[PDB]
UniProtKB/Swiss-Prot annotation:
Residues of the full protein shown: 411 to 441 of 947
Free-text tissue specificity from the UniProt record: Overexpressed in ovarian cancer tissues compared to normal ovarian tissues. Isoform 1 and isoform 2 are expressed in squamous epithelium tissues. Isoform 2 is overexpressed in squamous cervical cancer (at protein level). Expressed in blood cells. Isoform 1 is expressed in pancreas, lung, skeletal muscle, heart, placenta, liver, kidney and brain. Isoform 2 expressed in chronic lymphocytic leukemia (CLL) and several tumor cell lines. Isoform 3 is expressed in several tumor cells. Isoform 5 is expressed in fetal liver and several tumor cells.
Protein name (Swiss-Prot/TrEMBL): Zinc finger protein 268
Gene for this chain: ZNF268
Zn-finger region bounds: C2H2-type: 13-35
Annotated function: Involved in the regulation of antiviral interferon signaling. During viral infection, recruits SETD4 to TBK1, leading to TBK1 monomethylation, which is critical for the assembly of TBK1 complex and IRF3 signaling.
Factors inducing expression: Down-regulated during erythroid differentiation by GATA1. Down-regulated by HTLV-1 Tax through the CREB/ATF pathway. Up-regulated by the regulator of nonsense transcript UPF1. Up-regulated by the cyclic AMP-dependent transcription factor ATF4.
Family affiliation: Belongs to the krueppel C2H2-type zinc-finger protein family.
Subcellular location: Cytoplasm
Quaternary assembly: Interacts (via the KRAB domain) with TRIM28 (via the RBCC domain); the interaction increases ZNF268 nuclear localization activity. Isoform 2 interacts with CHUK and IKBKB; the interaction is further increased in a TNF-alpha-dependent manner. Forms a ternary complex with TBK1 and SETD4; the interaction between SETD4 and TBK1 is ZNF268-dependent and leads to TBK1 monomethylation.
């Protein structure tokens, strides 16, 4: 198998919270605030 997070597809938009690349900004922007809400990842 493989290891590490590496691939082919870099976007001009990156999340300053989870470091997740996106296609459009609109999505990213909302993806930033949305982080807090949808019961999922443990804030910590
Ligand atoms: Zn994010």
């Amino acid at each position: 198998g493989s290891s590490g997070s590496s691939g082919t597809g870099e976007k001009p938009y990156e999340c300053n919270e989870c470091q997740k690349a996106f296609n459009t900004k609109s999505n990213l922007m909302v993806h930033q605030r949305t982080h807090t809400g949808e019961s999922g990842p443990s804030s910590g």
